[PDB]
Design an enzyme around this catalytic site. Sequence first.
Site, PDB file in Angstrom:
ATOM      1  N   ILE A  16      -7.837  -2.586  -0.380  1.00  0.00           N
ATOM      2  CA  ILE A  16      -8.870  -2.009  -1.283  1.00  0.00           C
ATOM      3  C   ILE A  16      -9.818  -1.154  -0.442  1.00  0.00           C
ATOM      4  O   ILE A  16     -10.441  -1.632   0.485  1.00  0.00           O
ATOM      5  CB  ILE A  16      -9.648  -3.150  -1.951  1.00  0.00           C
ATOM      6  N   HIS A  17      -9.934   0.106  -0.755  1.00  0.00           N
ATOM      7  CA  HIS A  17     -10.844   0.986   0.028  1.00  0.00           C
ATOM      8  C   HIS A  17     -11.519   1.993  -0.917  1.00  0.00           C
ATOM      9  O   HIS A  17     -10.873   2.691  -1.682  1.00  0.00           O
ATOM     10  CB  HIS A  17     -10.030   1.692   1.129  1.00  0.00           C
ATOM     11  N   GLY A  18     -12.820   2.070  -0.870  1.00  0.00           N
ATOM     12  CA  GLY A  18     -13.546   3.024  -1.752  1.00  0.00           C
ATOM     13  C   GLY A  18     -13.263   2.695  -3.218  1.00  0.00           C
ATOM     14  O   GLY A  18     -12.978   1.568  -3.572  1.00  0.00           O
TER      15      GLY A  18
END
Lengths: 165, 133, 133
Positions: A16-18
């Site tokens: 999960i990123h941004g």
Amino acid sequence: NDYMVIGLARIDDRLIHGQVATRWTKETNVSRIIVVSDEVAADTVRKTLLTQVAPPGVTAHVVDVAKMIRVYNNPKYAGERVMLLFTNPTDVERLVEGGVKITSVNVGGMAFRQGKTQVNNAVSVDEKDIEAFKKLNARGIELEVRKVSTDPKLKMMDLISKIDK
Amino acid sequence: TIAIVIGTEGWAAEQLLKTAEMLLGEQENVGWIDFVPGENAETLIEKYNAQLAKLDTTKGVLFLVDTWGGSPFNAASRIVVDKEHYEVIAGVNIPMLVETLMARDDDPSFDELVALAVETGREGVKALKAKPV
Amino acid sequence: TIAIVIGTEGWAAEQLLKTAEMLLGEQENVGWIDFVPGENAETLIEKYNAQLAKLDTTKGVLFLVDTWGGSPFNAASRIVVDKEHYEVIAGVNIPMLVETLMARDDDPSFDELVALAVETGREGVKALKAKPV
């Protein structure tokens, strides 16, 4: 096929990123997310943080490749749409070998590293990652590279074809 | 979509937009202005108007500014005063920009978008702190 | 004073600092980094470390980053993990930066500064709305 339905398979060493997981969750209409990685599964601290930042209404799960094949072998999720998160295309070929059905794989992002070749703005591949992508393509599986659904879709083979012959 | 105009003291507005586009891809119907020492609110009103002329403002305009009470805020305030579907929200941050730009495409109502921008902007401010083990 | 390092996707950190200095005057003991496509958290950890080497970190370090969960946040998280007086706060905005920089000079305790940054960052997000007459 009469079991769980893979809504989408996104590869990303960052999981999960941004807002990538938030936007992709709403666009993919996904209410469940399963992470497949032995290295992360061995990190209880990271699992806690990912589970506590799991988007509202969306559940995040952490399992290993061996355990993932068993969760899919359970019709309890039949029809359920789940998103598969992977860190390397090698783990994807393993699920396919276990009899997992995949129609296409989407490359979200891959941390660059020395010895690897940059194919996209943030996607790197090593002789091992390329070999896995070629096997998936030989099985009629589509390989698309894209950071966001709003960005133009590129073919993994096309990017590797202009680099590796 | 609903138009968004970003304004801050200095030259940060253009970069906040660039940062957002690095996360979401290039955006349409978004404008920005800078504020340099020597300029006053009247200069800024003209700058905002020139940006608006290029935007689709039919569904409304949301001015996202740096701080409550600064020139960028004061000038934007004078424009939205008796206009329907015009609002100014101070404290612009990346979580607010990203969530707002994402929702905008699903064609929300003006009030819905304004409420989401304030809520996501505030919820986006969070400290890491010690984590459970 | 307590050290402050700003990190955001792209090149906005330098501008957020410039904006703050336009309001408060040039600041001491503040660092910043950029994050370009192709870089990973490990690259960022090095960038943060190079900035820290130049800062007075004796009273502590506050990393102010754009969003929870992005690379800038993830890298900063790895640095503060078992360090006393090290914290990461997401959702950086001008109200947070200005209030935090102002309070820093009155030599507050680390916990006091962290609490003030979160509170001012959140309270800084506010919509104009209709006003009473």
